[PDB]
Amino acid sequence: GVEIETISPGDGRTFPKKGQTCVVHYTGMLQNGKKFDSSRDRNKPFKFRIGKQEVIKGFEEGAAQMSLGQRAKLTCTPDVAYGATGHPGVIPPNATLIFDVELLNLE
Numbered sequence: 535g536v537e538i539e540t541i542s543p544g545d546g547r548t549f550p551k552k553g554q555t556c557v558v559h560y561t562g563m564l565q566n567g568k569k570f571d572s573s574r575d576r577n578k579p580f581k582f583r584i585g586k587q588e589v590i591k592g593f594e595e596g597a598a599q600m601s602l603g604q605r606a607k608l609t610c611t612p613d614v615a616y617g618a619t620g621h622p623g624v625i626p627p628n629a630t631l632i633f634d635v636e637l638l639n640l641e
Contacts, residue, residue, distance in 0.1 A: 544603030556639035
């Protein structure tokens with residue numbers, strides 16, 4: 535399940551498609567917890583493409599439901615990211631994810 539709660543500004547029309555490589559300043563957050571991940575720290579804006587299952591499933595669908603310049607607010611279910619397994623030492627088992635996501639892409 536992907537829930538979008540948009541911080542508005544942008545265009546609302548340029549949507550990501552297959553074969554396109556997009557650029558995201560992501561920012562993680564644990565529910566009732568602290569940060570666990572940031573692209574704001576490293577200043578390297580995480581260039582990735584669409585459709586290769588590179589990212590987790592919850593972040594994947596929320597990337598397509600945005601447009602250029604927009605700023606969404608994801609909410610990922612446990613079964614789409616890590617929930618039974620848990621990423622070792624960083625994401626606990628049965629975790630619910632929050633993501634500050636800005637889509638400033640190309641192509």
